[PDB]
Design a protein around this ligand. Structure first.
Ligand SMILES: Cc1cc2nc3c(=O)[nH]c(=O)nc-3n(C[C@H](O)[C@H](O)[C@H](O)COP(=O)(O)O)c2cc1C
Length: 363
């Protein structure tokens, strides 16, 4: 079933082998600008059922990693247009993953050199990636954030809305909202990072308010069948847990998302260091509540993907590190060929080496 077609909102994927969103930190600074090298990398992977791009800033304030691209400036839009054109010339489909990093950021890359923003003024207690004076990736402790004022929230929603308009002009087929992995939307969702006492904190209805406002805004801006969302609502991701009622709160959010008729729900099931697997009973509860495509991710093998797709519990799988290393992952999985070995030392930063130099089966 991995190599059978799937309707994903407004587009049709020819197979269920998707490229997960992968931050690679190779954009130009100043300007957070995508490059022709990035275009080549994505073009190489155009046989994917769907490419989901690296996380991309909705605004300058959204930036948390040096080398991550934006989709807010004219120069960024022009560069992304070239990248999507190359994917489409090879008959691929590409979604842009949009983020605001919130507290997973550093003052030195924020507007004005000021503290980054979040739901509450609590440090993430982790690291982000900056660049040194020679342009090389380095890890730095996160800056303690400032809590957003209530009157600043509409601007955040508008920044998501505008980035989606920009994505449409840039030629993306779909947008994926990053509501996972401890970034800004997840910072509001989780009671561990959200201690607000206004209508954006406290109850699950209040904690989900921002993400649902964003979903409504972007569905109105473009179309519901162009919108996907990534969540990581069970377990701990980048020091952000999901609170003491994680299953119930996840099912609440999913039931609300379903009302908007969005294209897909993408679940990041565990982080790279691992965690408890999803139960089939939980997967069935998610199916009961969501009527679009469900994508699973997190250390999947083709065997596990086939098992869960065959069981009718998910529709597609997003592979991360296997897609870094195998531009033709679809053909390799379909033919049961060996995969290229991974070189994790070049996942972040640098240039062509460890990026565009992983070969296909045939030249
Ligand atoms: C180098 C690297 C960068 C990542 N960047 C992102 C990202 O930009 N957005 C996101 O939602 N997840 C990100 N992730 C998670 C992946 O999308 C994916 O869920 C994970 O790699 C799946 O596990 P796998 O690599 O075992 O297939 C990243 C993972 C890696 C290894």
């Amino acid at each position: 079933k991995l190599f059978t077609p799937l309707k994903v909102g407004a587009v049709t994927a020819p197979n269920r082998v998707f490229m997960a969103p992968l931050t690679r930190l190779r954009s130009i600074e100043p300007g957070d600008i995508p490059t022709p090298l990035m275009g080549e990398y994505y073009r190489q992977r155009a046989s994917a059922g769907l490419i989901i791009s690296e996380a991309t800033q909705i605004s300058a304030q959204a930036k948390g990693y040096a080398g991550a691209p934006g989709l807010h400036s004219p120069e960024q839009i022009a560069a992304w247009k070239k990248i999507t054109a190359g994917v489409h010339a090879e008959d691929g489909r590409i979604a842009v993953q949009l983020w605001h990093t919130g507290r997973i950021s550093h003052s030195s890359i924020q507007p004005g050199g000021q503290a980054p923003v979040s739901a509450s003024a609590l440090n993430a207690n982790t690291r982000t990636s900056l660049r040194d004076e020679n342009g090389n990736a380095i890890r730095v402790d996160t800056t303690t954030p400032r809590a957003l004022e209530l009157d600043e929230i509409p601007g955040i929603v508008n920044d998501f809305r505008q980035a989606v308009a920009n994505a449409r002009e840039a030629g993306f087929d779909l947008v994926e909202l990053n509501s996972a992995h401890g970034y800004l939307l997840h910072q509001f969702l989780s009671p561990s990072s959200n201690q607000r006492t206004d209508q954006y904190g406290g109850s699950v209805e209040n904690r989900a308010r921002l993400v649902l406002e964003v979903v409504d805004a972007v569905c109105n801006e473009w179309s519901a069948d162009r919108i996907g969302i990534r969540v990581s609502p069970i377990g701990t991701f980048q020091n952000v847990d999901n609170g003491p009622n994680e299953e119930a709160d996840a099912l609440y959010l999913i039931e609300e998302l379903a009302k908007r008729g969005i294209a897909y729900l993408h679940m990041s099931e565990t982080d790279l260091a691992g965690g408890k697997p999803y139960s089939e009973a939980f997967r069935q509860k998610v199916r009961e509540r969501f009527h679009g495509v469900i994508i699973g991710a997190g250390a999947y093998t083709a065997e596990k993907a086939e098992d869960l797709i065959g069981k009718g519990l998910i529709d597609a799988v997003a592979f991360g590190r296997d897609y870094i290393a195998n531009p033709d992952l679809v053909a390799r999985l379909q033919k049961k060929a060996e995969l290229n070995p991974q070189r994790p030392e070049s996942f972040y930063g640098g240039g062509a080496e460890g990026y565009t130099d992983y070969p296909s089966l045939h030249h």
